[PDB]
Ligand binder design. Structure first.
Ligand SMILES: [Mn+2]
Ligand SMILES: [Mn+2]
Lengths: 201, 201
């Protein structure tokens, strides 16, 4: 039922920021595996077949105990990676544009300050996880999550995410997570972020 | 003044099971960083300068709140990597020997069954962490931990450990964690596992 989304670009089109082999494995093995495991967990619970990915991740307590973890982990993996691919682009980078640029300045004063704060949140996530920009009411804030956990469980709406699982960066950057994060800003699709923000409100 | 331990073997000596680049970075960068951050956290707390690593990690609940996470994470990293290196060897692999082989048969029926159980525990540890063989009273058992957490916390004594942080295996095995686990078995220093068992009594 859940499907692996096609990327908007080819596996070599985020070079040199993200290497081609990594993008192909990260999408075609890691993300594909979360989708397949999510579908396996839900196969035999047809009462859940019409839940959207968001509904599942917003209501994890109410699932059968046999599958809550599988849905948390693989549903999370599906959600997080799907957003990650959407917010990068072969012609991204630079400063925010559109309506969201304005709300960014409102809450962070400058874009450079947002970049500093999200970068710190991502680098400071110990072990596997993500850094996030979220809408919490009218407010923009930065946070991190462990593993494939998401902000939806907390009522916050993701606009932008960076994957700091070691698989996201180890082939090119090895232990140098901060160098990966510095490079990742060059890929950011501010057009798509602005679309996510409008959707959110 | 914790120190990075010397390996018992050169960086190319676990080939072809673990690549030399990985071994060099994993010991010389990752493990070194945990040691350096551990020493940095303890520097301002003179009370603690004579506590052993085992003491620190068995009594986290009592450290200053300003540094407990730093000690858990970096003390953990030094403990876990220090054991990881001593349980592998260029002479390792195969079926267990010595007294521990008899205790393995006693609790698992056969060694092949221990191997299945520990491999499963390592593979199923979602995110970053470790798989362990521990002594829990007189009884030996298999478990996993997240991040740089150890069984000491819980009163159990480590005899053997596998690192399943992605940094342990990504350069050679990428997403194929099961393949990495299969190869790691060819490295196991059963002499050292035996010594750790005898001491655990
Ligand atoms: Mn990922
Ligand atoms: Mn490690």
């Amino acid at each position: 039922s859940f499907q692996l989304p096609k990327l908007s670009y080819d596996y070599d089109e985020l070079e040199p920021y993200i290497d081609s082999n990594t993008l192909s494995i990260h999408h075609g093995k890691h993300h594909a595996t979360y989708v397949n495991n999510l579908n396996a967990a839900l196969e035999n619970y047809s009462e859940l077949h019409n839940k959207s990915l968001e509904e599942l991740l917003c209501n994890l307590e109410t699932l059968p105990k046999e599958i809550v973890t599988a849905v948390r982990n693989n549903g999370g993996g599906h959600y997080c990676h799907s957003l990650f691919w959407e917010v990068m682009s072969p012609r991204g980078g630079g400063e925010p544009n559109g309506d969201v640029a304005k709300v960014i300045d409102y809450y962070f004063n400058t874009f450079d300050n947002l970049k500093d704060q999200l970068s710190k949140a991502a680098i400071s996530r110990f072990g596997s996880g993500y850094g996030w920009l979220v809408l919490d009411g009218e407010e923009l804030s930065v946070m991190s999550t462990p593993n494939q956990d998401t902000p939806l469980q907390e009522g916050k709406i993701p606009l932008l995410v960076i994957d700091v699982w070691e698989h996201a960066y180890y082939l090119k950057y090895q232990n140098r997570r901060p160098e990966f994060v510095t490079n990742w800003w060059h890929t950011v699709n501010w057009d798509r972020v602005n679309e996510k923000y409008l959707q959110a409100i």
